[PDB]
Amino acid sequence: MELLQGKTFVVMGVANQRSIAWGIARSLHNAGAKLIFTYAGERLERNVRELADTLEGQESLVLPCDVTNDEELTACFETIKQEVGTIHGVAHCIAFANDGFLLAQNISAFSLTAVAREAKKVMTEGGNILTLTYLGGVAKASLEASVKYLANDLGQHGIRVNAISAGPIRTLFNSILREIEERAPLRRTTTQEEVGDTAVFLFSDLARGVTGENIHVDSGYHILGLEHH
Amino acid sequence: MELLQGKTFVVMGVANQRSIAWGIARSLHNAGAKLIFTYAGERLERNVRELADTLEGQESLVLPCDVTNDEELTACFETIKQEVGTIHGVAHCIAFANDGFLLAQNISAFSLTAVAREAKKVMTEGGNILTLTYLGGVAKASLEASVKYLANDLGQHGIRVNAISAGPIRTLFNSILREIEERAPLRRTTTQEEVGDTAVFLFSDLARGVTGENIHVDSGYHILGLEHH
């Protein structure tokens, strides 16, 4: 409720109001954070500006940042350095890209390292880098290794690196959702708000001892070992 | 800071001010929780009463509860039902018992199921059951399975079941601590306060989508795969 007061975070991956990243943004906002949003292209630019505009409180920067474009990614964090100086985390949470879910998984896998490289330059007081896998796995193997590499590389600078694995979300197939509602320990599917509230923890000082972790927000389904069912 | 306002938790395992469970208690207290403490024997009884007395705010019940004693364990939660009615979680966090660390690991392993059995009777609004492994593993294999079993059994009642794996803590061997300070991603050893603040998350509504999890609070050391080093 004031867990994140005084802290500023970059949120990547907002496409519309049902985006997992918009759940993260809403949660971070409610915990008192200032937000900087990125947008890939012209289409998403408007969607992000309009959603950001619906938040009440500290102004939100909205900046271009195609994470597959090294020049633009670098430019984005240069703008951040010049205008706010220090940030306290990045939500690398692109779960759909313009098939679209797989595309986002691949882009997430090969862009995390460069994102962390630029983020380190403006996280001079430490903080957390969050990445997201949406379950709704060559790229997953890659992301897992990258998180461990970056956690080990950046921890000495006070920067934690963690992942959330989010289960299928109805507003994002009916046979898959029914299986989860019937068989997952919590007997329900995941929400964007549940993912966002776990992100609040990971970005907060409560999680200062947690790094290199992959937290499942999937109603417990992961414990069942039903990957190939 | 008011994350846990209106909620009451049972904390097991407090032996002295450097107990991991006392870190959990302090953190839960600071987040607005009401606390019920247990004590095994006469010795610990005084230590717990004196520590509980140092907290300012809502009164803390201090009750006898040897978790290896079925009659006393049952009686404890019966007293809880009669006096407060509903609780919102249990911290099953015995990490030393009166060699003492291993003894606590074994007692933790075979007592979790019965503790969860009684806790279910007073957690009518759901909540979280937390268990602790202190790294400072037949019993660990057992606890892992028990957490998964209980998460799957109790989730339908809104009860989450999670574990924290805590790394070596200096106030609880110097060669082990030096290795962690030099090689762990965060370049430092764990504290009881870091464990407590992760417990705050798991007991809060922020973690309502998280169950069957084992969160490492170990400065990231777990990612290195140096179990036999």
From Swiss-Prot, chains A, B:
The record's listing under SUPFAM superfamilies reads: NAD(P)-binding Rossmann-fold domains
Q: Which pathway does this polypeptide act in? A: Lipid metabolism; fatty acid biosynthesis
Which positions are annotated as binding NAD(+)?
G13, S19, I20, D66, V67, I94, K140, I169, R170, T171, L172
The record's annotation in Gene3D superfamilies points to:
NAD(P)-binding Rossmann-like Domain
Q: Name one Pfam family in it.
A: adh_short_C2
The catalytic activity, as recorded, is: a 2,3-saturated acyl-[ACP] + NAD(+) = a (2E)-enoyl-[ACP] + NADH + H(+)
Q: Which residues form the active site?
A: Y134
The answer on whether this UniProt entry bears the keyword DNA repair reads no
A cellular component term, taken from the record's GO annotations: catalytic complex
UniProt GO BP: fatty acid elongation
Does the entry feature the keyword Oxidoreductase, yes or no?
yes
Might you give the EC number(s) for this enzyme? 1.3.1.9
Question: What keywords are annotated for this sequence in UniProt?
Answer: Fatty acid biosynthesis, Fatty acid metabolism, Lipid biosynthesis, Lipid metabolism, NAD, NADP, Nucleotide-binding, Oxidoreductase
From the Swiss-Prot or TrEMBL record, what is one GO molecular function term? small molecule binding
Class of the enzyme per the UniProt entry, highest EC level: oxidoreductase
Give the transmembrane ranges: none
Q: Give the record's subunit note.
A: Homotetramer.
**Reported function:** Catalyzes the reduction of a carbon-carbon double bond in an enoyl moiety that is covalently linked to an acyl carrier protein (ACP). Involved in the elongation cycle of fatty acid which are used in the lipid metabolism.
Q: Which family does it belong to?
A: Belongs to the short-chain dehydrogenases/reductases (SDR) family. FabI subfamily.
The protein, known as: Enoyl-[acyl-carrier-protein] reductase [NADH] FabI
Q: Which organism is it from?
A: Bacillus cereus (strain ATCC 14579 / DSM 31 / CCUG 7414 / JCM 2152 / NBRC 15305 / NCIMB 9373 / NCTC 2599 / NRRL B-3711)
